[PDB]
Design a protein around this ligand. Structure first.
Ligand SMILES: [Mg+2]
Ligand SMILES: [Zn+2]
Ligand SMILES: [Zn+2]
Ligand SMILES: [Zn+2]
Lengths: 160, 133, 158, 86, 196, 49, 141, 114, 264, 65, 559, 43
RNA sequence: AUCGAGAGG
């Protein structure tokens, strides 16, 4: 692997280094090995990095994998969008997938939740668990046909 | 309203490049040595053979719209054979007591170096160029 | 070094060189006090959060840290006088321009950023179509629907 | 619950008016202008109610307030005279 | 379209005077862009022009069959015998000015087909019209004079702009808006409401 | 120039589209997946003409 | 008379076919450089020869002129469009009562024809016109 | 369905004048004339004959849309020179050259024998 | 002769004229062929009333054929536009009515040519409405074919029109147009592979102009003044009267502008 | 389905040249190029009107009513 | 999600679209048929009643007109069948459902809506044809093509709604997009191809064309610029004429591969105060590039100036291109005889390389690379050999192309086309690939029944030596079709999966907005990011800046 | 009309791809687009 | 209105 690193002058120079690539992962066992840098080793399996190096290293591995997916084809997306997706997956304490049993099992109301997938089961369980919806969500006000608390509806307007 | 430079150059090198109507030219002044010039000419209008010799002038005049010549009595400041209008876009200090001036005649470029022009050639929109015979 | 940041300073400096016509011979009228104290007050006035509590002001200093690094790098005293040759008028105009353009660049509360983020990822993915690693849409599905059974798990060892 | 408002001092919301509250202000103003409301600017022959609302905004003669809500339930009232437009 | 996936709608119609013309007074029946050519690599179009030109001049047919030993060099050698430029290029003149086109134009006969799709069989506008029975929403399709679908993808896209009142209007005023009487005890809409 | 090959039901011309199927009475071997307990399987689709 | 056989997909596993009858001529220079690169078929023990390779294509693909000079998704894309090109579908259109019929005023046989068109009766029942086409930039419409 | 009637290329509509002349903002002696129901046949000829006049500075025509048949012609002359006079002189020069062309052609045609 | 543009006619016939336009502005030569295509008027069929059509062609097919038939329009100046006449629908001072009757009496297929057109309206003695027949056999344009039992009876009202409104009123087919066949003006940059001279064909009009001297440089201020044109007519108006009426229509079109300038 | 009156590109009348085309083909035993040259069709825009024509009217006659 | 969250809606229309170079960027071409159909309620003010009465007088049968009148009591008046359609007495407090008129805000949509820039507000320009006309430089955010695409259009019905359309969702506001922090709109095919030929140093324009080109620019000062060349023939440069479209106060600096300030071959780009100094204009200057000219004008001058700048460039370049002309023929695909001989010699030496590696692997003299089999190494070496072959032949072709070559001109302008298209058309299409590998042995130990069994040659496993110009052999044609089928399958699979991927993404992040403390939150109030994007700034107002402190020695940093 | 009569439907481990066995017995190109591509083929 | 088929991007 070619690599740029500072010379003792301070100018960046090319210091190419031998780097190992594998075909599997038990990273919990592999970093505890002499002759490697346990501060630099990296997995393409971000889920093992979340399990081993904490959840916040899982954030960086998840972002780096999405970034590599985007930049393989050559496209650019800004940091904030991918970081928003990553932090949404990472806020609940662990990796929360974007699936019907991922984000869509959360406490995020019921009418918003019934709008994605498993509509009838979600409505049934919300009727059974005696759920209450704040209707602060976008999809609740879309269903109710009201001005949602969004950009032009985040506030009231009154007189002086 | 007056002439800001006058010299006489012998062309060293002519280069068509990838162009069929424009050649880049490289000349040095034979009057005063070590003062040289690189300049983009249109050879269709004014053919510039190699190892020729020709006068080079720069004026300040002789904003408002462009009236046509319209008459023989409109006082041209030119018995010259090739005149262009340009704009200086950079002044280069190659060394102390040395200068290089950069002009663009709408894309055709000009390098002129030396230190004889030490009281003129300011950064002005007004810029002409006259070449004689 | 090239990184996406707010207000472009090359364009501001070239606009100041053209607006106030700048000569590269005559010296400036900038005391060192003006340059340094004006840059340090400009850093104070590049506002993102407005709470007077310690936590929110610390978050404000954190939120402007990269842009302040860029600003101090480009508005150094030798860089201003030796390279840009700014006058006092042009310098205060640059300060006003930077402050106003920064305050324009702040996000507007209410803007639905999540839908915009998801569409911002979905559009190039819709054009993603085609070295034996999982890339593109199957890798993106592996990432999104969390892949315990990854097709290509690897380990880059240093 | 009762009077959860933030006073006029100690307000951290942006004094710069956002494009969203600007668009809501111009829309509500052109809405009431459309239904024959009194206008508070010498109009220089303008007839489009949106241009009327925009020229009222530039001359600051719009008596409305922006109640910016906060996620705890509190809110901040900002007059149009306070809000900078850029 | 043509026989090479070169689809296209008529952007505008010009008359013979505004059309560019060669020195033989010939005008194109059709003008396509040179920008549809390289990204799709439809060389058979450009060989069809050449072979059809030489067939129209010779009066014979064009053996455009696949897997033949027909060469573009042989077709060009044929075309040069008929007085034209061997690559299908022709000096063409501007229709508005008569000044010669600075570039030379790829000109020739080419089999073009008129497709099934036409504008007036596809054009549709509704603004206000019939409604469905069960949902009280606009009916489907233009054959019933119906409404265009403001999809959930469009709902997401319009949320991204933050257009709140436009979204409420499109989801109430341009569709099944309705008033219902409800109570505070049940919270359900079983209120017998005699309005007058 | 008409070629035939179609049916006329209720004045509308109808075509029976050729269906594709795997042949019967042929012996084929399927190497099953890695988490499958059976490794290989020999299938024959038995049918009489 | 045994000059031709009926070979299906399974039986052709066991046979060797020549692509064109010039492959059976013996071997032994000056060559036109514009022709394609035809590989010398190093095999010599054939059982069959193809009639003509043009017969690998269907009815709609045999309409395409020079499809050996086009990329393959283009030949695919056209074959779904020729089923939407208007023309004389039948000569008794003024007798039938089809729910929708579209006839071209002056149909034209193409100036570039495949030899396979004659069995598809395209020159006798065409579906387009030999339009005079210029490929040029002209006011950007 | 939607296309306009084809006579609108030359037939003047309701309340449509032939020429509409308007002064130019930020131009001393310039004027812009909307020619209605015309094409490049008239505009190119008027402009090219205008540019032969020595006392005129600027003359150019433009077709704002190929849908409608109309064009705008802007003329700019010297002081003491109404551009309408330059337009009239150009038009009369056009008519004189056309008449000379027609007479010379009739002469050369009557000389011919077939 | 008279000063201004100069004409030398190379060749001429009743259907083609080939001449040289010398000392002309180029925009005049362009507007000449533009008017020669579009704006000089001609009489052709603009309404068809169909009584019986037992043919296999639709009636609008037949009407589209009939509109394209060349009718004589030599004295079209003495015929007014129907929008300009004061009649109710069409009269003798604006329109010309042809009629067409044909029956499949023969066992063999009977053709309908344009020669079978029968003029009904009173011409009032002007050379107008005769279908021009340049065929060697005297039959007109082959309009239709009929078997036994098929008939066709219709009535065509022809009116005055210009080729801007519809190309059926087109009086000329193709205008050959070439200036500077040597490209001594360098008005176009030729496309070549090895040599532009050998890969591009030499025009016949290169004979009527001097080849450029390669030792002499490019003439900067030379302009396009000599033109090589050929006008072909379908036969509605003769070839001389195509270009003469083009010149006259161009003069009249300039004169209407001159008149509107006075009226303003 | 029958001979067009005039060329689409040129405008030259071609409708009167069909029977002469077929007589020059069959009676005089000529090829198509010399027939199109004899009929005065020199531009190829005019030539593709006659050469690429399928006279389908002859089939439409065959239907009896 | 079928009736709620998505509905068929009133005041909606769709048609086939086409592109109009003489329309503005924010303008949409609306047919009169649609404009006579779609209405807007206008309340009667003192300002409008003199126009509204004339609109009602015109009736619903011509485009300036109205269809319904809503009285204050609430009973609608149908102007198509009524007695009082001539003697209406408009009183204040009533509504007139007038037609669509010019310079009206409308939503304009292209139906795969994977973008906020796929539904944008537009100013109405009413046109007499049935197609929706739009500017070429608005195609890319919609991903529109004029091969038969249909586009939707929605019409607001209240004043706040039109305000939300015009002040938030307008076309000039969405020029710089938050995604990719760059302009999504730019100059497209014809303008992009002609602006390069315009900006060449050879390109000189005489007075007659210069005057019309100047008058074509809408917002003009009326000042004819001083020409570049004066004495032998007064001539202008295309750089000199194009700069009138650029507003004064624009500064653009760009250096690339070889860029002196004398810049031979006209590389780079230098623009100062609405005038360019040197540089051929192409896609990196005037396309959708980050830090490009549209970025500069949108950021400095504003959105409206940039939107008018689009049309100002388009009119001038389209006029110059229309009077210049440009084409493309098969001669643009033909290289030299010597170049074709050298290309087939390259293919032949690659074939000999493949034969020698094949014999080396057959004699079991191959060295097994670690981690892979012998056959994997063999397949990798032969695939890399044939890819090197077709790339070297394509570069041998691209060297042989002239500057007049029109495919090369479209490549150099960045309008359309790439190097691989030239390689496949002129030199060699190359090696077909199925499921990542070469053409698999679909038959027993062979690919086609014209090959002997166990043939691992390039022709047997799907290398296509001939080009699209020369013509493919039957086997080559079948292998190419075998690859293209997988290409179309992958296209359909990519679309079908990515629609679901986008839907799941959006429905997961649909509630995420910046509240009034810069805390990126959802409906519950849970904090996703405490500061949005970790800095609290909009991605629209963000450009690539170099940081001069990072690189270089400590000594140069000290100096 | 010709291409409709010679139409093969394949209702439903890589079926949609053009198999090598398809040589001479089915059209390599003539197939629908997008949804159900390669399942429907004409011989 | 349900089911189904074909087609356009
Ligand atoms: Mg499309
Ligand atoms: Zn209750
Ligand atoms: Zn009358
Ligand atoms: Zn013709």
């Amino acid at each position: 692997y070619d690599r740029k690193v500072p010379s003792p002058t301070g100018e960046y120079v090319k210091e190419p280094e031998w780097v190992l690539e594998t075909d599997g992962v038990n990273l919990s066992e592999v970093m505890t090995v002499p002759g490697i840098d346990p501060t630099r080793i990296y997995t393409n399996s971000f889920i093992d990095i979340m399990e081993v190096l904490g959840i916040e290293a899982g954030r960086a591995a998840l972002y780096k994998e999405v970034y590599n997916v985007i930049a393989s084809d050559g496209s650019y997306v800004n940091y904030r969008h991918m970081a928003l997706l990553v932090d949404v997956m990472t806020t609940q304490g662990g990796l929360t997938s974007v699936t019907r049993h991922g984000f869509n099992r959360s406490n995020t109301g019921a009418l918003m939740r019934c709008s994605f997938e498993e509509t009838v089961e979600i409505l049934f369980e919300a009727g059974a668990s005696a759920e209450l919806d704040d209707c602060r969500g976008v999809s609740e006000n879309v269903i109710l046909g009201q001005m949602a608390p969004i950009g032009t509806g985040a506030f009231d307007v009154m007189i002086d | 309203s007056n002439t800001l430079f006058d010299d006489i150059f012998q062309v060293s090198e002519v280069d068509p490049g990838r162009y069929n109507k424009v050649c880049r030219i490289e000349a040095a002044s034979t009057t005063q040595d070590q003062c040289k010039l690189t300049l983009d000419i249109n050879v269709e209008l004014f053919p510039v053979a190699a190892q020729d010799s020709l006068t080079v002038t720069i004026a300040s005049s002789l904003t408002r719209s462009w009236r046509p010549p319209q008459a023989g009595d409109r006082s041209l400041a030119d018995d010259y054979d090739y005149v262009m209008y340009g704009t200086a876009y950079k002044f280069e200090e190659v060394s102390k007591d040395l200068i290089a001036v950069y002009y663009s005649f709408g894309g055709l470029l000009m390098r002129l170096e030396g230190n004889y022009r030490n009281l003129n050639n300011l950064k002005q929109e007004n810029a002409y160029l006259l070449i004689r015979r | 070094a090239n990184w996406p940041l707010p207000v472009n300073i090359r364009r501001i400096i070239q606009n100041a060189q053209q607006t106030f016509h700048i000569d590269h011979t005559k010296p400036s009228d900038l005391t060192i006090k003006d340059i340094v104290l004006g840059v340090k007050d400009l850093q104070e006035n590049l506002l993102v959060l407005r709470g007077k509590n310690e936590i929110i002001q610390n978050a404000q200093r954190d939120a402007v840290t990269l842009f302040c690094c860029l600003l101090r790098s480009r508005l150094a005293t030798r860089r201003v006088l030796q390279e840009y040759r700014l006058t006092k008028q042009a310098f205060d105009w640059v300060l006003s321009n930077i402050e106003a353009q920064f305050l324009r660049s702040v996000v507007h509360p209410g803007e639905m950023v999540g839908v915009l983020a998801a569409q911002s990822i979905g559009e190039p993915a819709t054009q993603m179509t085609l070295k034996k690693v999982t890339s593109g849409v199957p890798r993106l599905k592996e990432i999104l629907n969390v892949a315990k059974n990854m097709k290509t798990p690897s380990l880059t060892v240093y | 619950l009762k009077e959860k408002a933030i006073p006029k001092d100690q307000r951290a919301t942006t004094p710069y008016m956002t494009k969203y509250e600007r668009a809501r202000i111009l829309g509500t103003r052109a809405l009431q202008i459309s239904m024959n409301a009194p206008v508070f600017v010498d109009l220089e022959g303008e007839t489009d109610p949106l241009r009327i609302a925009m020229k009222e905004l530039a001359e600051k003669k719009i008596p409305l307030v922006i109640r910016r809500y906060l996620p705890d339930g509190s809110f901040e009232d900002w007059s149009v005279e306070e809000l900078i437009v850029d | 379209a043509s026989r090479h996936g070169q689809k296209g709608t008529i952007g505008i119609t010009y008359r013979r005077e505004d059309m560019p013309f060669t020195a033989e007074g010939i005008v194109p029946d059709l003008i396509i862009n040179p920008h549809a050519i390289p990204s799709r690599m439809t060389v058979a179009h450009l060989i069809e022009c050449l072979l059809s030109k030489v067939a129209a001049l010779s009066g014979n047919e064009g053996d455009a069959s696949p897997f033949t030993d027909i060469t573009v060099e042989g077709i060009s050698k044929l075309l040069r015998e008929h007085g034209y430029q061997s690559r299908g290029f022709e000096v063409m003149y501007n229709g508005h000015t008569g000044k010669k086109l600075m570039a030379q134009i790829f000109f020739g006969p080419t089999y073009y087909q008129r497709l099934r799709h036409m504008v007036d069989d596809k054009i549709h506008a509704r603004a206000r019209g019939p409604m469905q029975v069960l949902t009280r929403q606009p009916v489907e399709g233009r054959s019933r004079d119906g409404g265009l679908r403001f999809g959930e993808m469009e709902r997401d896209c319009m949320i991204a702009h933050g257009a709140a009142s436009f979204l409420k209007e499109r989801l109430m005023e341009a569709s099944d808006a309705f008033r219902v009487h409800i109570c505070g005890i049940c919270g359900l809409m079983t209120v017998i409401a005699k309005l007058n | 120039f008409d070629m035939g090959g179609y049916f006329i039901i209720n004045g509308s011309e109808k075509v029976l589209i050729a269906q594709e199927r795997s042949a019967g009475n042929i012996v084929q071997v399927f190497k099953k997946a890695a988490p499958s307990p059976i490794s290989h399987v020999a299938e024959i689709r038995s049918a009489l003409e | 008379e045994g000059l031709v056989e009926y070979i299906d997909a399974e039986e052709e596993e066991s046979i060797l076919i020549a692509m064109q009858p010039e492959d059976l001529e013996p071997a032994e220079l000056d060559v036109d450089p514009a022709k394609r690169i035809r590989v010398s078929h190093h095999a010599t023990t054939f059982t069959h020869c193809e009639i003509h390779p043009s017969m690998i294509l269907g009815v709609a693909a045999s309409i395409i002129p020079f499809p050996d000079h086009n990329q393959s998704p283009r030949n695919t894309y056209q074959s779904a469009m020729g089923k939407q090109a208007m023309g004389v579908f039948l000569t008794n259109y003024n007798v039938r009562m089809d729910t929708m019929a579209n006839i071209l005023y002056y149909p034209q046989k193409p100036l570039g024809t495949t030899r396979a068109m004659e069995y598809l009766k395209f020159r006798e029942l065409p579906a387009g016109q030999n339009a005079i086409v210029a490929i040029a930039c002209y006011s950007g419409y | 369905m939607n296309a306009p009637d084809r006579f609108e290329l030359f037939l003047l509509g309701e309340g449509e004048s032939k020429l509409k002349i308007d002064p130019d903002t930020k131009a001393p002696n310039a004027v812009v004339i909307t020619f209605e129901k015309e094409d490049h046949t008239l505009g190119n000829l008027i402009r090219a004959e205008l540019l032969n006049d020595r006392k005129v500075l600027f003359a150019a025509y433009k077709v704002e849309h190929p849908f409608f048949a109309r064009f705008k012609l802007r003329i700019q002359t010297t002081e003491g020179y109404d551009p309408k006079d330059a337009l009239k002189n150009a038009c009369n020069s056009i008519i004189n050259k056309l008449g000379a062309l027609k007479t010379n052609f009739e002469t050369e045609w009557n000389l011919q024998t077939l | 002769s008279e000063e201004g543009p100069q004409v030398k006619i190379r060749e001429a016939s009743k259907d083609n004229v080939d001449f040289i336009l010398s000392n002309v502005d180029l925009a005049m030569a362009n507007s000449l062929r533009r008017v020669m295509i579009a704006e000089i008027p001609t009489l052709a069929i603009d309404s068809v009333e169909v009584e019986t059509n037992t043919t296999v062609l639709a009636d609008e097919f037949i009407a589209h054929r009939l509109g394209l038939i060349p009718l004589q329009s030599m004295d079209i100046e003495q015929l007014e536009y129907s929008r300009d006449c004061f009649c109710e629908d069409h009269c003798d001072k604006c329109s010309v009515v042809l009629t067409l009757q044909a029956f499949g009496e023969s066992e063999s297929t009977t053709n309908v040519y344009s020669k079978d057109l029968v003029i009904v309206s009173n011409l009032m003695g002007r050379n107008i409405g005769h279908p021009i027949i340049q065929d060697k056999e005297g039959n007109g344009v082959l309009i239709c074919k009929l078997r036994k039992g098929q008939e066709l009876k219709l009535t065509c009202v022809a009116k005055k029109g210009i080729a801007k409104e519809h190309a059926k009123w087109g009086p000329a087919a193709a205008i050959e147009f070439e200036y500077d066949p040597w490209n001594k003006l360098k008005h176009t940059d030729y496309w070549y592979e090895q040599d532009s001279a050998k890969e591009w064909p030499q025009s016949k009009n290169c004979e009527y102009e001097d080849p450029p001297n390669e030792g002499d440089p490019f003439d900067y201020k030379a302009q396009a003044d000599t033109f090589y044109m050929n006008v072909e007519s379908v036969g509605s108006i003769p070839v001389d009267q195509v270009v003469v009426r083009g010149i006259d229509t161009l003069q009249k079109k300039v004169a209407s502008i001159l008149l509107a300038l006075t009226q303003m | 389905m029958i001979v067009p009156v005039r060329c689409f590109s040129c405008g030259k009348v071609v409708g009167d040249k069909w029977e002469s085309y077929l007589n020059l083909l069959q009676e005089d035993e000529l090829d198509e190029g010399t027939a199109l040259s004899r009929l005065g069709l020199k531009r190829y825009c005019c030539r593709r009107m006659i050469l690429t024509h399928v006279d389908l009217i002859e089939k439409f006659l065959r239907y009896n009513p | 999600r079928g009736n709620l969250m998505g509905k068929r809606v009133d005041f909606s229309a769709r048609t086939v679209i086409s592109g109009d170079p003489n329309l503005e960027l924010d303008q949409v071409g609306v047919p009169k048929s649609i404009a006579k159909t779609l209405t807007y309620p206008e309340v009667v003010t003192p300002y409008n009643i003199d126009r509204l009465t004339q609109l009602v007088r015109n009736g619903p049968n011509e485009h300036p007109g109205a269809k319904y009148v809503i009285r204050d009591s609430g009973d609608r008046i149908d102007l198509r069948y009524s007695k009082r359609a001539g003697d209406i007495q408009l009183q204040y407090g009533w509504k007139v459902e007038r037609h669509i008129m010019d310079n009206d805000p409308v939503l304009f949509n292209r139906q795969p809506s994977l973008h906020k820039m796929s539904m944008m507000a537009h100013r109405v320009k009413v046109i007499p044809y049935s197609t929706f006309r739009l500017n070429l430089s608005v195609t890319s955010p919609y991903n529109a093509d004029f091969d038969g695409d249909e586009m939707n259009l929605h019409v607001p019905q209240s004043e706040e709604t039109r305000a939300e359309l015009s002040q938030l969702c307008a076309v000039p506001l969405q020029i710089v997009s938050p995604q990719s922090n760059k302009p999504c709109m730019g100059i497209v095919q014809d303008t992009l191809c002609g602006i390069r030929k315009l900006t060449l140093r050879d390109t000189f324009i005489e007075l007659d064309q210069v005057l019309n080109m100047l008058y074509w620019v809408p917002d003009w000062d009326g000042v004819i610029p001083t020409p570049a060349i004066i004495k032998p023939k007064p001539l202008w440069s295309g750089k000199q004429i194009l700069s009138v479209a650029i507003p004064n106060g624009i500064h653009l600096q760009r250096f690339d591969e070889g860029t002196t300030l004398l810049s031979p071959k006209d590389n780079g780009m230098l623009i100062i105060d609405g005038q360019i100094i040197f540089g051929v204009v192409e896609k990196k200057t005037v396309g959708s590039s980050n830090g490009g000219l549209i970025h500069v004008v949108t950021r400095e001058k504003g959105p409206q100036v940039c939107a008018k700048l689009f049309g100002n460039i388009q009119k001038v370049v389209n006029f110059w291109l229309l009077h210049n002309g440009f084409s493309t023929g098969i001669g643009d695909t033909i290289a030299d005889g010597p170049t074709m001989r050298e290309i087939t010699e390259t293919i032949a030496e690659a074939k000999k390389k493949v034969l020698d590696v094949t014999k080396e692997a057959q004699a079991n003299l191959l060295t097994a690379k670690h981690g892979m089999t012998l056959r994997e190494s063999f397949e990798d070496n032969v695939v890399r050999f044939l890819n090197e072959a077709r790339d070297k032949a394509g570069r041998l072709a691209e060297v042989n192309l002239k500057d007049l070559n029109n495919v090369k001109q479209m490549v150099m302008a960045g309008s359309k086309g790439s190097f691989i298209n030239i390689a496949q058309m002129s030199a060699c299409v190359g090696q077909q690939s199925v499921e990542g590998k070469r053409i698999a042995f679909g038959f027993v130990d062979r690919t086609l029944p014209h090959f002997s069994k166990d043939d691992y040659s390039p022709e047997s496993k799907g290398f296509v030596e001939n080009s699209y110009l020369r013509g493919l052999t039957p086997q080559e044609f079948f292998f190419h079709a075998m690859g293209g089928r997988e290409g179309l399958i992958d296209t359909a699979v990519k679309t079908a999966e990515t629609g679901y991927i986008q839907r799941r993404l959006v429905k997961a992040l649909e509630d995420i907005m910046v509240h009034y403390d810069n805390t990126t939150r959802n409906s519950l109030g849970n904090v996703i990011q405490f500061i949005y994007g970790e800095d609290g700034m909009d991605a629209a107002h963000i450009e690539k800046q170099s940081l001069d402190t990072i690189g270089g020695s400590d000594a140069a940093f000290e100096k | 009309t010709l291409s409709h009569l010679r139409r093969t439907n394949t209702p439903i481990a890589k079926p949609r791809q053009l198999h090598n066995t398809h040589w001479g017995l089915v059209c390599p190109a003539e197939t629908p687009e997008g949804q159900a591509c390669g399942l429907v083929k004409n011989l």
